[PDB]
Design an enzyme around this catalytic site. Structure first.
Site, PDB file in Angstrom:
ATOM      1  N   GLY A 104       0.810  -1.206   0.000  1.00 29.01           N
ATOM      2  CA  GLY A 104       0.000   0.000   0.000  1.00 29.01           C
ATOM      3  C   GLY A 104       0.850   1.266   0.000  1.00 29.01           C
ATOM      4  CD  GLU A 105       2.941   0.454   3.392  1.00 32.74           C
ATOM      5  OE1 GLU A 105       3.308  -0.503   2.705  1.00 32.74           O
ATOM      6  OE2 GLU A 105       2.061   0.341   4.244  1.00 32.74           O
ATOM      7  CB  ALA A 106       3.095   6.327  -2.039  1.00 30.29           C
ATOM      8  CE  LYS A 108       6.839  -0.265   2.900  1.00 28.45           C
ATOM      9  NZ  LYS A 108       8.232  -0.456   3.255  1.00 28.45           N
TER      10      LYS A 108
END
Length: 195
Positions: A104-106, A108
């Site tokens: 989910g983390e932008a 990554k």
């Protein structure tokens, strides 16, 4: 010790390492490495994840998105396992987005898509002269898939809207309209299968 026993013990510890990985990727890899079931090299860890036998795609993506040096090296080796020569951008994306589930983390996702863009361009030298064009168009394709196929997005962009949204990104010029058309139609006719 003895061969048959050793093999059966090894196979069950391997099954245990997979379960461990699926609860916490770094702990699973640690168990397999310490038990001599996996060599601790960037390419051996990447082949293991590429095979993905009994591994959750979410946990593969989580491991591949870690910021530390070894995980970044495994990411680069993992992307290098993907053969993209003579595939169009959608075909290559279908293959890549099936091998793991994006975190989910932008930040990554950004590392992962940059590594994809670099591999696609290295494998297909003529198509995009800039890796930035490839990165931008990859996200355009992903967003088009959501727009055409998610019923909550009312009013799906037509081919002309998709062409006009991508003007100027090909080193100041435009991409060949036949390329944009082929990507649009491929996505219209066959949604991305996400794991």
């Amino acid at each position: 010790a003895n061969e048959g026993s050793k093999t059966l013990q090894r196979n069950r510890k391997m099954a245990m390492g997979r379960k461990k990985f699926n609860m916490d990727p770094k702990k699973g890899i640690q168990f397999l490495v310490e038990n001599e079931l996996l060599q601790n090299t960037p390419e051996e860890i990447a082949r293991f994840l590429y095979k993905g036998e009994g591994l959750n795609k979410t946990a593969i993506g989580d491991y591949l998105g870690e910021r530390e040096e070894l995980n970044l090296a495994v990411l680069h080796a993992f992307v290098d396992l993907h053969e993209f020569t003579d595939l169009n951008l959608v075909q290559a994306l279908r293959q890549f987005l099936w091998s793991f589930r994006l975190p989910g983390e932008a930040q990554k996702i950004d590392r992962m898509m940059e590594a994809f863009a670099q591999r696609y361009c290295l494998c297909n030298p003529g198509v995009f002269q800039s890796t930035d064009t490839c990165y931008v168009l990859s996200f355009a394709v992903i967003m088009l898939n959501t727009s055409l196929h998610n019923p909550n997005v009312r009013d799906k962009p037509g081919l002309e809207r998709f062409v006009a949204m991508n003007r100027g990104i090909n080193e100041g010029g435009d991409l060949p309209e036949e390329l944009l058309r082929n990507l649009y139609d491929s996505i219209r006719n066959e949604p991305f299968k996400i794991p």
